[PDB]
Write an enzyme that holds these catalytic residues in place. Structure first.
Site, PDB file in Angstrom:
ATOM      1  N   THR A   1       0.812  -1.227   0.000  1.00  0.00           N
ATOM      2  CA  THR A   1       0.000   0.000   0.000  1.00  0.00           C
ATOM      3  C   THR A   1       0.836   1.263   0.000  1.00  0.00           C
ATOM      4  O   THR A   1       2.067   1.253   0.078  1.00  0.00           O
ATOM      5  CB  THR A   1      -0.908  -0.044   1.229  1.00  0.00           C
TER       6      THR A   1
ATOM      7  N   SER B   1      -4.617  -3.007   1.076  1.00  0.00           N
ATOM      8  CA  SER B   1      -5.020  -1.613   1.351  1.00  0.00           C
ATOM      9  C   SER B   1      -5.171  -0.842   0.029  1.00  0.00           C
ATOM     10  O   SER B   1      -6.059  -1.172  -0.764  1.00  0.00           O
ATOM     11  CB  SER B   1      -4.110  -0.925   2.349  1.00  0.00           C
ATOM     12  N   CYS B   2      -4.376   0.147  -0.310  1.00  0.00           N
ATOM     13  CA  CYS B   2      -4.533   0.883  -1.557  1.00  0.00           C
ATOM     14  C   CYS B   2      -4.037   0.148  -2.755  1.00  0.00           C
ATOM     15  O   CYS B   2      -4.257   0.605  -3.893  1.00  0.00           O
ATOM     16  CB  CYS B   2      -3.865   2.260  -1.456  1.00  0.00           C
TER      17      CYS B   2
ATOM     18  N   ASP C   1     -10.498  -4.869  11.396  1.00  0.00           N
ATOM     19  CA  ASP C   1      -9.675  -3.820  10.801  1.00  0.00           C
ATOM     20  C   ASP C   1     -10.113  -2.464  11.374  1.00  0.00           C
ATOM     21  O   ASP C   1     -11.316  -2.123  11.262  1.00  0.00           O
ATOM     22  CB  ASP C   1      -9.837  -3.906   9.288  1.00  0.00           C
TER      23      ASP C   1
ATOM     24  N   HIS D   1      -5.547  -4.747  10.496  1.00  0.00           N
ATOM     25  CA  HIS D   1      -5.429  -4.337   9.084  1.00  0.00           C
ATOM     26  C   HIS D   1      -4.284  -5.006   8.381  1.00  0.00           C
ATOM     27  O   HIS D   1      -4.380  -5.285   7.163  1.00  0.00           O
ATOM     28  CB  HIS D   1      -5.280  -2.800   9.083  1.00  0.00           C
ATOM     29  N   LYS D   2      -3.193  -5.286   9.063  1.00  0.00           N
ATOM     30  CA  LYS D   2      -2.014  -5.948   8.486  1.00  0.00           C
ATOM     31  C   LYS D   2      -2.092  -7.447   8.690  1.00  0.00           C
ATOM     32  O   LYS D   2      -1.302  -8.055   9.396  1.00  0.00           O
ATOM     33  CB  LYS D   2      -0.720  -5.361   9.041  1.00  0.00           C
TER      34      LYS D   2
END
EC number: 4.1.2.47
Lengths: 256, 256
Positions: free
Chosen positions: A10, A79-80, A206, A234-235
């Site tokens: 990300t 993520s992104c 998350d 999140h990770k």
């Protein structure tokens, strides 16, 4: 079955985020490439040289270009990184066996490329101690960011160990979402990106890509398959590495 | 007692090597700075811009310059970082409470600055799959290197976990020993470097800085104190992190 996985970090991160997952996938027999995108990780560019998400994606496009005919890969974006996937799929769809979204943005083909980023910013508007700056490239004003250490600790790396959080403090760099550039970009195509198989992996624990956002994305653009990982943060490639590897094995056995 | 530790990585590495030690020292109450030297880690320079070990050391010198009067630090250098220590001590000796050498080169004041590097290359002449290149800077031909992945696995990271070795594959960069530049450099001074307290930490299981070399260094230039860590590998801050923290606590309680 064995696959060639291409792991895509990300914004403000680099290949280093995959340092636990990559050896686990190799221990299953797979080939793994973990790229640094432009101005990320140990890539030699600085963000102020980069004018769009497409330019940011260059290392992924260059990698895909270099695959000989007939070789396909499974893209895995965190993520992104889902935006890098969409960009890549509009140039190299025939080289992509499947794309796996890992607590990731899930762009569509019906709305502008910024659509899911705009939505994220509504669901998660307070980035805590994150700092911002502007620079100009190719006549446009770009908003850069540097992720705040409290945001990193509490929202991105919530359940990661102190040595993993330390790596993020040491290695995260200035980056950009290029949000305003995405808002003006031609839409992702149905023939390219729309045609690839899409597997959505997430956790409802998350603390940044919150359940309202991720469930909204799933409803907006139906994945081919959804995997929900219980627990973690999140990770997931740090907190649930084994579970992620097990999912990716199943993907390799399903899509080629 | 609490101290301010300044952690100094080796060539081709960056601050990231300290990602386990730094939080452990902070959990003891210390202040910790882990620097990226020039063209290292996420520093924006490339090695071909750097013409000497002194230029390579700039981030450490700049950091020391920025300490207000009366503030002292304990320098901790791994592997080639002992050369950065010597350079720094010849400019900022009064800011240095002590220097800790961690499986590190130990320069002296009686011989030229290249002396212990020349000796290392005799003791350890085969760098396996390491690659070399040359570039020119300030009229001199510099030999750069990129550490081989087999050398990393077998000799530097021998007993480290696969996720730590993976970080080294991802993050190690091209670097240089600047050996020929060191050979022409003015000697380290007795008044500056010679005056600082020097603590030598090592393991006899180091597979690159072999016992013949480390015991030779100890005899060549007598440290104020020697600590031998049992077991581990060249990267004691990864394989013996707790033992290193315990030693550094004792150093903080002894030298101020």
């Amino acid at each position: 079955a064995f696959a060639h996985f291409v792991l895509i970090h990300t914004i403000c991160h680099g290949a280093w985020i995959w340092h636990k997952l990559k050896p686990l996938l190799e221990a299953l027999g797979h080939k793994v490439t973990a790229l640094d995108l432009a101005a990320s990780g140990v890539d030699p560019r600085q963000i102020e040289e980069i004018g769009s998400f497409d330019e940011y994606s260059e290392p992924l496009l260059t990698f895909l270009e270099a695959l000989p005919p007939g070789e396909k890969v499974i893209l895995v974006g965190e993520s992104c990184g889902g935006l890098n996937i969409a960009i890549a799929a509009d140039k190299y769809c025939e080289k992509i066996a499947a794309a796996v979204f890992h607590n990731s943005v899930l762009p569509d083909t019906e709305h502008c490329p910024s659509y899911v980023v705009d939505k994220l910013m509504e669901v998660f508007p307070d980035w805590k101690d994150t700092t911002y700056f502007t620079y100009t490239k190719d006549g446009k004003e770009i908003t850069g960011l540097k992720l705040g250490f409290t945001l990193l600790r509490e929202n991105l790396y919530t359940l990661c160990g102190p040595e993993e959080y330390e790596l993020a403090k040491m290695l995260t760099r200035k980056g950009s979402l290029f949000q305003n550039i995405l808002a003006k970009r031609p839409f992702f195509t149905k023939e390219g990106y729309g045609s690839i198989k899409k597997i959505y992996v997430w956790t409802d624990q998350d603390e940044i890509f919150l359940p309202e956002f991720q469930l909204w994305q799933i409803e907006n653009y139906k994945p081919d398959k959804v995997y929900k990982v219980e627990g973690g943060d999140h990770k997931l490639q740090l907190t649930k590495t084994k579970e992620i590897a097990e999912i990716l094995q199943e993907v390799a056995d399903t899509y080629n």
